[PDB]
Each structure stands twice: as C-alpha cells, then as structure tokens.
Design a protein around this nucleic acid. Structure first.
Ligand SMILES: [K+]
Ligand SMILES: [Mg+2]
Ligand SMILES: [Mg+2]
Ligand SMILES: [Mg+2]
Ligand SMILES: [Mg+2]
Ligand SMILES: [Mg+2]
Ligand SMILES: [Mg+2]
Ligand SMILES: [Mg+2]
Ligand SMILES: [Mg+2]
Ligand SMILES: [Mg+2]
Ligand SMILES: [Mg+2]
Ligand SMILES: [Mg+2]
Ligand SMILES: [Mg+2]
Lengths: 84, 94, 56, 136
RNA sequence: CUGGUGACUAUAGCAAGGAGGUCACACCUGUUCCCAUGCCGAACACAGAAGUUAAGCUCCUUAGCGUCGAUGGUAGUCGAACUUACGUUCCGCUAGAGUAGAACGUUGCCAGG
RNA sequence: UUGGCACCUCGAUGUCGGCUCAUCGCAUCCUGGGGCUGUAGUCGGUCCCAAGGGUUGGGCUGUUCGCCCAUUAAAGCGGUA
RNA sequence: CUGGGGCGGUCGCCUCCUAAAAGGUAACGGAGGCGCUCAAAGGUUCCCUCAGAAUGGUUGGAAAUCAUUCAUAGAGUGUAA
RNA sequence: UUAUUGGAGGUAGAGCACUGUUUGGACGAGGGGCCGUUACCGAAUUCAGACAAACUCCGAAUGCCAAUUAAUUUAACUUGGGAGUCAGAACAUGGGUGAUAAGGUCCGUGUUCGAAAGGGAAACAGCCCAGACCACCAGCUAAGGUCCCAAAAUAUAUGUUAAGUGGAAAAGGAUGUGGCGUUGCCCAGACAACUAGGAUGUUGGCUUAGAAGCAGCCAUCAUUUAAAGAGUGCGUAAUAGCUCACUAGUCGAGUGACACUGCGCCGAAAAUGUACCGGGGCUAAACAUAUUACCGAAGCUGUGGAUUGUCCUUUG
C-alpha cells in the first residue's frame, strides 16, 4: 500500500509547571514561615508581617490570619495579623 | 405625540421573551424629575409616534397616572428579526 | 417541616448530586425524610430538585 | 484576493463558529447591504467572486464596501499522508461569518440595482443572506 | 485660615481663567566658612535679607480631557428538560459597551493664626 | 479510485490476470417511446422514460488497462471477498 | 519513542500558548531559549530618571554632540519568554 | 452537602487602551512633473467600522481555598497484614490534531460499560429508566407506550398536513396550504378580460456597411391628446410587419404588493429481495397544543422467609 514520507515538527518542548499561586486562603490561620503565594515578580506584594523571598515567594513572619488586601488602585498585597 | 405604557415588576427571561413575542417593547424611563421606571410600550404605537415626532422629537409618555415629556435616549434593535428590543426614555427638564 | 421524597434514581447522576442526596438523609428511591425548613435545607433541595419532591 | 500582509502566527487554532455575530451588524458606509443569516467560513476566493459579480452588475456606477476580511489562516495536510508529525501548511485565508453580519455594502445606485447585484453576489457565497437597508 | 506630617481605588488628576503676600513658603543676594559640580555655587551646602509676588506654592471658578458611574436591556453561563439542530426551552447568576448621572476631593494628628 | 483509521480475522479469512459459471444495479452502449434543437432531407447534438433481450473475433503484452487489425445494431459502466 | 516497522525527527533543563479565570493536565500540537555570563553586571550608602518628537545650532547629514519644550513609559532591566 | 461571609485567579463574553491584523472617508510636515497648486502624499494626524490560542482598558457563570461559622449527613485520618491494576470503550460536553472526516487520535468534565442482571430503544456492552438476598397466579409507578401482532385510550377538545410527509439529505427552485401584520388601487367603477386608439417633429444624435422605438454609446425632449415610451417584446440586412406600455369604452366587486411565521413539494441514482415505520396496517393509528385515564421493571409497596449489623433490651 502506498505510504508517503512525513516531515518533522521542530516543537515538542516545555518546562515543568511550577505550581505557582496562592498557598493559603484569606482568613486562614497560618504558622510563622508558611508560604502564602508563589509568583514571578511581585504580582502580589508583601504586607504586614509578610516577607518576600529571593524568588518573590510571599511568606508569613508571624503566626496569624492571612488577609489579601488592596494596595492602591492597581496593586495588592497579602498580610498576616496576630489573632487576639 | 402621545403614547401610554405599563409598569413592570421583576421579570424573568421567559417573561421578557413573552413580552417581545406579544409585541411590546421593554423600556426604562429615567432623567429629570423622575425616578427610574421599568415600562412596557407597544411596538407599533411607538413606531407611529416616532414617525410623527422624528427621532429627537418629544413624546408624552403615560406612566401610570402621570404623563412625562421624554425623548428617546437610545434603543436596542434586533436586525435579524427587524424588531425593536429595548428603549430608553430620557425625561427632559422644562 | 418539609417532607422530601427521592422520586428519581441517583443512577446516572453526578457524584456531587448523589452526595447531596445522601446529605439530605435520603437512601433508596421513594424514600423520604421530614426536616426543618431553613436556607441550608432549601439550598440542598434546590441542588437536587430534579430528583426529589417536596411537600410542606 | 484579500489576505493580511503578515501575521504573527501562521498556524492558528480554527475559530469558534457557534454564537451570533459579535459586531458589524448594521449598514454603516453605504445605503444597502447583504446580511448573513447562517454561519460559515468565507474564503478570500468567495469574497473576490462575490465582489466581481456585484461590481460588474453595477457597471462601475456605484460604490462597494467589503465589510469582512479573511484574517485567519487555515492549514491543510499534504495529500495522502498519515495522522501526526506536526501541523500542516497554510492553505488559505477565511473570515468567520455568523448570523447578522453585513458582508457587503453598496451605495450610489437604485434599490432595484442594489437588490439584483447583491442577489448575484449572494449566489457565490456559502451562506444564506438577505437584502438590508440602513436603519432609522 | 496657614503650615508640617499621615490615611484613603484620581469623585482627589489635567487644562483653562482669576486672586494672594510685613507673618510664614518661595523666588531672591552672595561664596568667607562646612559641603559641592566628571565643567558650572545651575544643583547640593552654607551665610544672608536689598527686591518681588513674576514663577513656584496656596486659594477661587468650571465639566473641555482624564477619573467614577447606575437602572433597564443585551452577551455569556451553573443546573434542569428536550435535542443533534453553527441548537431550543425554563430557572438562577449576570457582564463588557453605552446611557442618566457623580465629581475641580474627603479626612486624622501637631504647631501657629 | 488513491488514501486516512486500525474495529473482525496472524492455534492462516490464498493474493494479480485468464478460464468455467453466472447473478444483480442503472448512473443506458444498441434496440423501443418522447421533448428541445443553431431539427430542410439523410444525418446529428442534448435531455427525459425505459434494465426485456442483446451487447464480436484477432495482433502485442502475465497482464488489468491500453494501442492496433477486421467487424457489429451495439462492441455499456459498475457491485457480488 | 513512533497513528505498523524501517528511514526521517526526538530524548535532560527553562518560558509561553493549547490549559476549559486555583493547582495539575496529552499528541511526531503551536512558538522560542539553556548546557552560560558578571570581580561588577555582587553588598551598602547617597544621588538621578527614560525612549521619542518639535524647534534653534558649525564641521553635522534624517540620525553624532549642545539648548529649550513636549513627552507616563512606547526606554532600560546581561541572556528566551 | 448546603447556607452565609472573605479571598486567589484573567477563561466565556466584550473591547480596541497596548502588541499585531484590517475597510472606507477627511486632511496633509513636506518635498518633487507644475506654474505656486489636479501623481506619490509614501509620514503624521483624524472620523467611522471590523479581527486575535500565544492582544487586554475590562470581565462573568462556575469551579477552587478558607471560616472559634449554622443545618442536614456519615464519614475521615494514622499505623500494620494481604492484594490486584499500569490494553480501556461508548455517549454527552470543553478543546488540540485531522478535513468544524472517521466507530479516528490526544487531553479536561460527567455518566454508563468494564465488573450490572431487570424494563425501553425491532434485534443492539457503552443510549433512556433503573441497581436482582429468597419466595408469591398481590398492588403503585419509571423510561417507553395504549388499532392488531402485543399489556393498556380506535380517549376528550381545538387546529395543521395530503406529502404515506410522518417513516433519510443541501444550495437552490415553486400562484401548495394555514396564521399574524403593514400597505397601494377600488361602485367618482378597481384587477383580469373584450372593443378602439396607441399619433406628430422623427429615420432624435453618434456610431456603422446598414442601426429607421427595439446591436452598441449620448441623451430621453417638445406638439394634438379622451392617452400614447425618442418605446415592452417578437420581427427585418435595414425597412416593413405584429405587439406592449398608456388611454377611452363594455362588465360589475373586490384586487395587487411587502414583512414575519406553522406545515408540506421538487432537488433525491446501486448493486441477493419489498428493504430508510420491526410487520400488518394507518389520513390518523401523523403532527402541535392542552386535559383525564390506564399499561408498563428484578425500581417502590404488601406477605412470608434467610444471613449479618444497630438499638431497646433476659423475654423477643
Ligand atoms: K448562497
Ligand atoms: Mg484506538
Ligand atoms: Mg481456526
Ligand atoms: Mg433510468
Ligand atoms: Mg435492458
Ligand atoms: Mg495507521
Ligand atoms: Mg490554571
Ligand atoms: Mg473571545
Ligand atoms: Mg472521558
Ligand atoms: Mg477485563
Ligand atoms: Mg396503575
Ligand atoms: Mg391489547
Ligand atoms: Mg427491590
């Protein structure tokens, strides 16, 4: 049976997905050090008691409740506040 | 240069569809001297009134007991059906 | 008080709807429960209303 | 033969064809228009055929506007090849048309001439159409 | 009322027109001193008080731009029923655009008036 | 037809052409009946109805095809592993 | 590996889209990068703000350097997105 | 699981503010052929209108993560003993690929099969209904049905269809038929038919061999009219000739156009045999909209029985 020659694709590559995004919910209690948000750049900024790691990961510095908040007109941040 | 309408309540999608099938046009009256009012008009009568008074003419809209002098602020149209689908009445100040 | 009866089967229905049928306390087809009316119950009913019959 | 002078991507996902016409549903340049009532891809070759038909009937008296443009390349595999081994090469260019879109408009002629010209045009197209005027 | 310093998604902005000065803020006068310019006392820094509201700055007017923005309707859509129709029907949710309209900021603390 | 797919069959579903024997479809090659014709006649062109019957011997080539010689009313096109 | 196998192509890592607004998600689906570089292109303190355009100006032109104005990011961010 | 509340995120839609794509105008910073002004105006600007998986000034429904959270429900997790599984399939839907091919292929979501018997779909794993512990010559229902095969309506009311459409298909074609609207003319006589006229400048001008209403271009005007086109078709080489438009008369009541819709018609040709309702048959026993019955499963209920749990509780 007749069979034609086929070409090749130069595509077929992709990197591993990095599981970015929110790691804890607004209103959730977290312990100090818990990662809050994985990101490239500052899509979300560190707020109160929140640090920004070398790769922009947002993390809690204290035990407390996570709160995602507006930051100005276009930006936002995430904060952690100690519970009473 | 007059036409009467009827107040509406809270209407489902089927309610609006049945209105348009019956041949009435939903509309909203708003502007000076009035609160927003949701109304039904009759499409044929509205077309006659618009032909008489022009696109920018003033219409005397019977809204319940009251009568309001309004202008057609805008309208939504269905060109596949050649059917006026919605109307906005702007009660103009005097 | 609401009398709720499972009038259609859960066979062939999504697992989420089956979970709601279970949470309402219904077991077999044509089984019934008597529950206190409130928004939570009404929400469960609304989720599975194509499967159940409600009597006040 | 219409086609973009260039595109960023030559190999594109084929467009969605369900739904209604997003825009261009009114005659806006001329007096009369040809309104689609069914859905189809419309090729540059079909556009050109319809344009020539209507303009030749109008005998250069009036003005014609093509309201749709074939932005989208579509590919096709080479003859008698098996599945796989990458996407095929660009075959042509199409405009997606859904009910309500005005395909062509005409001005500067009588309504009767416009009707006959747009009838001749519509017979070249893979969609059902209707003669439409400017609304007011 | 003025100033300093905060809070708030520009409803706070821009633009245009107009008013203001012993207090204060500036422009402004200088380069001895600390300090400074890849050159420049322009700037930064310092010393100072002859002149000016010209500009900044503050205040007032507005709706041209920017900002905000309904109601009503439409698109889309969860679920259900019917369906293979580039679908239909019912229910809930409900845009974007646009329209009316809002708006030439609102406020905390401190020191002076 | 050339393919695409890989669903039956790999503890076997024999594969081209010819011969023998056919059988069916009609989208009709001839014969039958019609319409139109840029159908004078004799001939033709094109389309419609029609499947009853009929639809050839040779040269070359494994060939099917195809070309050729000589006929015929005609030397139909396909399906049936 | 492979829409049978051979032949062709590919094999690890990064970015985007496909991906159905959490995350994840395939095909020999659509596009590109990497196997380094920097002794500062690192740390810290202080200071600063672009690209482009218009108008003037000598060698100097459409673009060199100088000046004013406008210019909200259209610049830059070593190297793909 | 639901309710309420908060939050992350950029899809559907939408839009054009960015990156690209693109259609018509307007105008042109500026120079050239041009004297100032009749290319290019490639620039820029500007008005309006469109396109996008890898565009976004915007932005859902859902889904997702949570809550000193309420209601209903019955799981959940840890550790250890034993596994099997690593060929999946259809259907529906969101997508890629392919050709908006495949009972194709590859991902997302759901159901069913696998591993599911029973009823429906003629027969038919994957569709629709529904999950068989056992027995009954009891009852109610589901999907689907109720003229006969074959259980139950030759049911009730109002319509549509004439095509066996129902019981296979498109662009397109058509005085099929029903409904709802708009609108022209008309007893100051409409539409059709019949009687008569249908003329003059003039064979309009050009072109052509010829072109005289009637090959093709330019016009498309005037006079008598009770009206008649520089002419609607046939005809001629061109004329001629016939005819229409238009008008008057006869007659006497309706007549034409358009838009949106329901149901039908043609387009429609394959091979063993009717053979594209399961059959007979059907003009309803088809279709649409309502209403009341009934049939219909291993679903549910009734009665008795088995086993294993739970709870009262010796008993049962
Ligand atoms: K067509
Ligand atoms: Mg397979
Ligand atoms: Mg065997
Ligand atoms: Mg035949
Ligand atoms: Mg025969
Ligand atoms: Mg294969
Ligand atoms: Mg995601
Ligand atoms: Mg979209
Ligand atoms: Mg699946
Ligand atoms: Mg098995
Ligand atoms: Mg019964
Ligand atoms: Mg019987
Ligand atoms: Mg049972």
């Amino acid at each position: 049976a007749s069979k034609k020659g086929v070409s090749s694709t130069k595509n077929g590559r992709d990197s591993e997905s990095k599981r970015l995004g929110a790691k804890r919910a607004d209103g959730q209690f977290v312990t100090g050090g818990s990662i809050l948000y994985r990101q490239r750049g500052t899509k979300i900024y560190p707020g109160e008691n929140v640090g920004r790691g070398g790769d922009d990961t947002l993390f809690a510095k204290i035990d407390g409740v996570v709160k995602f908040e507006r930051k100005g007109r276009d930006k936002k941040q995430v904060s952690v506040y100690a519970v009473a | 240069s007059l036409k009467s309408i009827i107040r509406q309540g809270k209407q489902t999608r089927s309610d609006l569809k049945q209105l348009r099938k019956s041949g009435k046009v939903p509309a909203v009256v708003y502007g000076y001297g009035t609160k927003n009012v949701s109304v039904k008009v009759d499409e044929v009568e509205f077309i006659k009134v618009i032909r008489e008074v022009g696109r920018n003419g003033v219409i005397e809209l019977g809204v319940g007991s009251k009568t309001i002098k309004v202008m057609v602020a805008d309208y939504q149209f269905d060109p596949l059906k050649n059917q006026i689908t919605h109307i906005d009445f702007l009660a103009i100040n005097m | 008080k609401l009398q709720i009866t499972l009038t259609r089967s859960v066979i062939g229905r999504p697992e989420t709807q089956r979970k709601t049928v279970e949470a309402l306390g219904l077991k077999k087809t044509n089984s019934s429960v008597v529950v206190e009316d409130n928004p939570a119950i009404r929400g469960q009913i609304n989720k599975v209303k194509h499967l159940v019959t409600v009597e006040e | 033969m219409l086609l973009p002078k260039r595109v960023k991507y030559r190999r594109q996902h084929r467009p969605k064809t369900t739904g209604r016409s997003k825009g261009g549903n009114y005659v806006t340049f001329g007096e009369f228009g040809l309104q689609a009532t069914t859905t189809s891809w419309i090729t540059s070759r079909q556009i050109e055929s319809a344009r020539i038909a209507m303009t030749r009937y109008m005998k250069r008296g009036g003005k014609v506007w093509i309201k749709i443009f074939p932005h989208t390349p579509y590919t096709k595999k080479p003859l008698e090849v098996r599945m796989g081994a990458g996407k095929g090469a660009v075959e042509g260019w199409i405009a997606v048309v859904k009910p309500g879109r005005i395909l062509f408009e005409v001005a500067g002629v009588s309504e009767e001439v416009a009707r006959e010209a747009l009838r001749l045009a519509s017979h070249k197209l893979p969609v059902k159409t209707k003669f439409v005027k400017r609304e007011e």
